[PDB]
From Swiss-Prot, chain A:
Name under which the protein is recorded: COP9 signalosome complex subunit 5
Species name: Homo sapiens (Human)
UniProt: Zn(2+) binding residues: 130, 132, 143
Motif (JAMM motif): 130-143
Location relative to the cell: Cytoplasm, Cytosol; Nucleus; Cytoplasm, Perinuclear region; Cytoplasmic vesicle, Secretory vesicle, Synaptic vesicle
Swiss-Prot record, chain C:
Record gene name: COPS2
UniProt-recorded name of the protein: COP9 signalosome complex subunit 2
Organism the protein comes from: Homo sapiens (Human)
PTM (free text): Phosphorylated by CK2 and PKD kinases.
Subunit structure: Component of the CSN complex, composed of COPS1/GPS1, COPS2, COPS3, COPS4, COPS5, COPS6, COPS7 (COPS7A or COPS7B), COPS8 and COPS9 isoform 1. In the complex, it probably interacts directly with COPS1, COPS4, COPS5, COPS6 and COPS7 (COPS7A or COPS7B). Specifically interacts with the ligand binding domain of the thyroid receptor (TR). Does not require the presence of thyroid hormone for its interaction. Interacts with CUL1 and CUL2. Interacts with IRF8/ICSBP1 and with nuclear receptors NR2F1 and NR0B1. Interacts with NIF3L1.
Lineage: Eukaryota, Metazoa, Chordata, Craniata, Vertebrata
Family of this protein: Belongs to the CSN2 family.
UniProtKB/Swiss-Prot annotation, chain D:
Gene Ontology terms: biological process: protein deneddylation; protein neddylation; regulation of protein neddylation
Residue segments, region Interaction with Vpr: 175-280
Tissue spec. comment: Widely expressed.
Complex and partners: Component of the CSN complex, composed of COPS1/GPS1, COPS2, COPS3, COPS4, COPS5, COPS6, COPS7 (COPS7A or COPS7B), COPS8 and COPS9 isoform 1. In the complex, it probably interacts directly with COPS2, COPS4, COPS5, COPS7 (COPS7A or COPS7B) and COPS9 isoform 1. Interacts with the translation initiation factor EIF3S6. Interacts weakly with RBX1. Directly interacts with COP1 and 14-3-3 protein sigma/SFN. Interacts with ERCC6.
Keyword entries, A-Z: Cytoplasm, Host-virus interaction, Nucleus, Signalosome
Protein name: COP9 signalosome complex subunit 6
Species: Homo sapiens (Human)
Location in the cell: Nucleus; Cytoplasm; Cytoplasm, Perinuclear region
Alphabetical list of PANTHER family matching this protein: COP9 SIGNALOSOME COMPLEX SUBUNIT 6, EUKARYOTIC TRANSLATION INITIATION FACTOR 3 SUBUNIT F-RELATED
UniProtKB/Swiss-Prot annotation, chain E:
Gene source species: Homo sapiens
PANTHER family, sorted: UBIQUITIN (PTHR10666)
Gene name of this polypeptide: NEDD8
Site (Interaction with UBE1C): 8, 44
Any Pfam family the entry gives: ubiquitin
Protein name, as recorded: Ubiquitin-like protein NEDD8
């Protein structure tokens, strides 16, 4: 590998994967002083949840069984993205449809944050999460009310809803990050029927962020080196067939976005053509990545022994 | 019209013709690429003739 | 068979020459091709607009 | 091997996150010290969670303060009711003397503490996690204490397994200057390198059996022959046709989208050109 | 006094108050100043919720006082 | 697949009401075993003609097709029948999915073989791993 | 079919194409003249993996160089335009 891969890993220095784990205090102070989310309202669109935070939240949600559980999530912000670096449980007692956090959670919050600041946890609380055991991931009326209350005073705040029952029964995590609109502000204007069917009655009162996950380099190495079923599943992952339907849906809404961009460019100020081009480049890049994986597998397995 | 068929005048049988979806998309996409590149080159020359301010006087 | 097919009750077609009935074990996940057709059509219209913006 | 210890794939993630956080905070790799939590039932110890610990350094010696540990114990007792202290953990290479002093300190808290040790600086294909246990000797004169290694399992629950599978399966993790190719081809490279290591070891064993270092094991060589006979995986004509179909589909999807990027650049150039060469 | 309070999201408020002020007048002052509903407020001192039926006499405080402000939460 | 010669000792112990012919010359016993044989034969075949299907099940050409179409349409077996050329297609693999399955099996054999290597001569395996650096 | 029952081989018969598609078969007995062929096949596979690994590294380096080149040119144009802008601003 010599010079080629010597600086390509450089374990002495944090890689580009571990960049997000560094906390810049000055940048955080500058962004919270500027308050760019006050002018717009659909500002934050992405929620990046760390692997450990997602694992802890999922395990807490499942530990409650059929009873609701809740906790807080630490993190920061960067541009239009809300990054969640950790999560921590609350000592609350709830029923299958109601969790209150009466008097032991509020002392635990402050005491746990004070304890965490002692051992080098520079992040502050960024959100609150609770579980919906068996009725989807959505914001109820009181959930919307408390989200408004948290957002109006503690400005950066995202509500995460988990569903342990569907997570277990489907094999994939069911999670959703949401943000709400101010009281009596922004009433913007087959869709409504399904929208009220899967969301609550307050469909227009809150919006859903796009949830993505990340992990560090050490986490990636430990995970891929944990079991033998992780490199076997990489050499036979077979993309372009596991998620072909997602690709077709992306092409469809790409076509809709291209039509909108064509309509806009013929004559609020968003430059839709650039976003459509970015989406097209992204989906084409996933397609080419899948083809590269197939080519590598063919060269590795088929082209051996005549 | 609405009929998608091919008349066989030898045995006098009207066979129904089904288009191939995969080949149709490849033919149309490649045709669009050929047309688009021709328009791009023509526009590129138009930019040159506009910057140079060339006209018939 | 003709009445059922015209009523969208039976998914198939009749081969009158050989006295056959070919069913419709077809229509797989070919929505990718239709999505690509929409992508090509939008690109065809968008390209013309960009060139003819001003001159 | 003395007691039997089961490990959960959450202590590993906690230790890795702590190490990454400290490395990014202080700029350089730095030893971290935490604490292990789990359930002990007779001879079966199970580690389910962990939390960070606070330590001070005087001269060349590490002292773990007990007030913070007791407050954090009271903290975690409110959430994990039936969970108890089991041991501690550290990051580094082989066990060091400082590890023995810290183990002596921990022994004042609990009678029989465990000792986990992660090695983020490892350069081999086995899990860096190694679990040790204290042993007291009767050596004449001065009395010393030693570490005995342990064999650990990797027991997981349903939700933990789902979360670990979801985290390890996804590979869309890149962010920053590096290209996404540099984030996907590296995962492919690691998988291929693991397969290459396994095949190289198998070939070395086969050659050693041929030479005479290892005894002639008929069954192992028969299975190696069977492995070799399957190497040309599915070289049929139908597979080639399907592969060519896939390649052409990806080529067309790339063409439609290269056209889009070119159209976007065309719009940008036209917009920049109009305001400069405006004919008014 | 030098009362210094923070929210959990890292926000900061500093108020100069007289040591033995009745909490009702403080509530009215914050009502007309900022407008946070008092019934949706929780105050934490040294990991303990401030009991309403108790005056601020036994809380011997002199300089660098830390107060934590938490808003009520609910789920389901 | 159960042949008709190992069931003679089973039909003797059956209760008298279970040995009732269905007015077609075939008893109850050699109707469930026929359906079981057909369902098991769909796990060894990708397609089979009517004549050959009626060679291991008796019921030469007219009843094997009837039973085969009867098992389908009831959610009992997967397949379809092409009556023109007389062939029953049970389950066809799509090439590319088979390629990934065989890759998974190939990697499984690699892991299992190395497991036996480290189980038979552990002292040699450790030396080999360390020597892999050099 | 009887051979499949003993599990020496696995597969599915194909009457239309007159083929037997074998998915797995046991390894028969070995002698001291095919072990060299075992080494040859496995050594060729090891060299195949090395060639793929080398190709992956080269493509990663080339892609990263292209990213750095495009970023440098993008910042070079932005640097030049600001210089001429500041000059006439009093």
């Amino acid at each position: 590998a010599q010079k080629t891969w010597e600086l390509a890993n450089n374990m002495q220095e944090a890689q580009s994967i571990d960049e997000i784990y560094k906390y810049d205090k000055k940048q955080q102070q500058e962004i919270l002083a500027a308050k760019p989310w006050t002018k717009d309202h659909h500002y934050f669109k992405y929620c990046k949840i760390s692997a450990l935070a997602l694992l802890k939240m999922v395990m807490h949600a499942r530990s409650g069984g059929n009873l609701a559980v809740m906790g807080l999530m630490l993190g920061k912000v960067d541009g239009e993205t809300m990054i969640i670096m950790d999560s921590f449980a609350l000592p609350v007692e709830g029923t299958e449809t109601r969790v209150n956090a009466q008097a032991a959670a509020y002392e635990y919050m402050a005491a746990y944050i004070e304890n965490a600041k002692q051992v080098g946890r520079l992040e502050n609380a960024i959100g609150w999460y609770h579980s919906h055991p068996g009725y989807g991931c959505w914001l109820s009326g009181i959930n919307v009310s408390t989200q408004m209350l948290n957002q109006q005073f503690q400005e950066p705040f995202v509500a995460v809803v988990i569903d342990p029952t569907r997570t277990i029964s489907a094999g994939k995590v069911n999670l959703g990050a949401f943000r709400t609109y101010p009281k009596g502000y922004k009433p913007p204007d087959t869709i409504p029927l399904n929208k009220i069917e899967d969301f609550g009655v307050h469909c227009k009162q809150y919006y859903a962020l796009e949830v993505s996950y990340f992990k560090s380099s050490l986490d990636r190495k430990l995970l891929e080196l944990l079991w033998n079923k992780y490199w076997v599943n990489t050499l036979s992952s077979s993309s372009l067939l596991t998620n072909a339907d997602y690709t077709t849906g992306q092409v469809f809404d790409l076509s809709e976005k291209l039509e909108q961009s064509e309509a806009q460019l013929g004559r609020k100020s968003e430059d839709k053509l650039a976003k459509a081009t970015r989406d097209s480049c992204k989906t084409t890049i996933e397609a080419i990545h899948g083809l590269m994986s197939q080519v590598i597998k063919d060269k590795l397995f088929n082209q051996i022994n005549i | 019209g609405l009929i998608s068929a091919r008349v066989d005048s030898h045995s006098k049988i009207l066979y129904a013709r089904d288009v191939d979806q995969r080949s149709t998309t490849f033919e149309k996409s490649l045709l669009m690429g050929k047309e688009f590149q021709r328009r791009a080159k023509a526009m590129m020359l138009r930019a040159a003739v506009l910057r140079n301010q060339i006209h018939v006087k | 068979l003709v009445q059922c097919i015209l009523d969208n009750t039976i998914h198939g077609r009749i081969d009158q020459v050989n006295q056959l009935l070919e069913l419709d074990h077809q229509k797989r996940g070919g929505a990718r091709y239709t999505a690509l057709d929409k992508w090509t059509n939008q690109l065809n219209s968008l390209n013309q607009a960009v060139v003819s913006k001003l001159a | 091997g003395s007691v039997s210890v089961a490990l959960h794939p959450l202590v590993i993630l906690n230790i890795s996150d702590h190490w990454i956080r400290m490395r990014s905070q202080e700029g350089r790799p730095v030893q971290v010290i935490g604490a292990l939590i789990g359930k002990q039932e007779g001879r079966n110890i199970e580690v389910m969670n962990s939390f960070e610990l606070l330590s001070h350094t005087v001269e060349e010696k590490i002292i773990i303060d007990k007030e913070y540990y007791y407050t954090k114990e009271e903290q975690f007792k409110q959430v994990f009711k039936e969970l108890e202290f089991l041991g501690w953990y550290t990051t580094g290479g082989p066990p060091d003397p400082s590890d023995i002093h810290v183990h002596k300190q921990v022994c004042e808290i609990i009678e029989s503490p465990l000792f986990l040790k992660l090695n983020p600086m490892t350069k081999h294909t086995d899990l860096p996690v190694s679990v040790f246990e204290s042993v007291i000797d009767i050596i004449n004169g001065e009395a010393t204490m030693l570490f005995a290694e342990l064999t650990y399992t990797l027991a997981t629950e349903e939700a933990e397994r789902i979360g670990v599978d979801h985290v390890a399966r996804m590979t869309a993790t890149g962010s920053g200057e590096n290209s996404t190719v540099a984030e996907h081809l590296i995962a492919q490279h690691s998988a291929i390198k693991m397969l290459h290591s396994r095949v190289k070891l198998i070939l070395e064993y086969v050659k050693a059996s041929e030479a005479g270092e290892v005894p002639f094991n008929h069954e192992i060589l028969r299975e190696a022959y069977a492995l070799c006979h399957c190497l040309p995986v599915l070289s049929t004509d139908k597979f080639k046709t399907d592969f060519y179909d896939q390649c052409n589909d990806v080529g067309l999807m790339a063409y439609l989208g290269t056209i889009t990027k070119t159209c976007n650049t065309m719009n940008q150039f036209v917009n920049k050109f109009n305001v400069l060469y405006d004919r008014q | 006094m030098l009362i210094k309070v923070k929210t959990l999201t890292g926000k900061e408020i500093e108020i100069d108050i007289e040591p033995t002020d009745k909490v009702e007048r403080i509530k009215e002052r914050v009502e007309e100043k900022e407008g946070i509903p008092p019934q949706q407020q929780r105050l934490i001192y040294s990991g303990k919720q401030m009991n309403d039926e108790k005056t601020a006499a036994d809380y011997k405080i002199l300089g660098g006082s830390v107060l934590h402000l938490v808003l009520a939460l609910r789920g389901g | 697949i159960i042949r008709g010669n190992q069931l003679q000792e089973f039909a003797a112990m059956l209760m008298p009401h279970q040995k009732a012919t269905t007015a077609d010359g075939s008893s109850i016993l050699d109707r469930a075993v026929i359906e079981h044989n057909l369902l098991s034969a769909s796990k060894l075949y990708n397609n089979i003609t009517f004549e050959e299907l009626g060679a291991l099940l008796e019921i030469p050409a007219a009843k094997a097709e009837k039973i085969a179409s009867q098992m389908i349409t009831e959610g009992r077996m997967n397949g379809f029948i092409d009556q023109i050329d007389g062939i029953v297609h049970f389950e066809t693999r799509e090439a590319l999915p088979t390629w990934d399955k065989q890759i998974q099996s190939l990697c499984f054999q690699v892991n299992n073989l190395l497991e036996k290597i480290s189980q038979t001569a552990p002292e040699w395996t450790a030396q080999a791993m360390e020597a892999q650096m050099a | 079919i009887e051979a499949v029952y003993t599990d020496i081989i696995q597969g599915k018969l194909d009457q239309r194409n007159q083929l037997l598609e074998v998915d797995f078969c046991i390894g028969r007995d070995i002698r001291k003249k095919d072990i060299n062929n075992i080494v040859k096949t496995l050594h060729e596979w090891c060299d195949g993996c090395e060639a793929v690994l080398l190709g992956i590294e080269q493509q990663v380096l080339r892609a990263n160089q292209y990213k750095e080149n495009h970023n440098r040119t993008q910042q070079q144009v932005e640097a030049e335009v600001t210089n001429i802008k500041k000059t006439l601003k009093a």
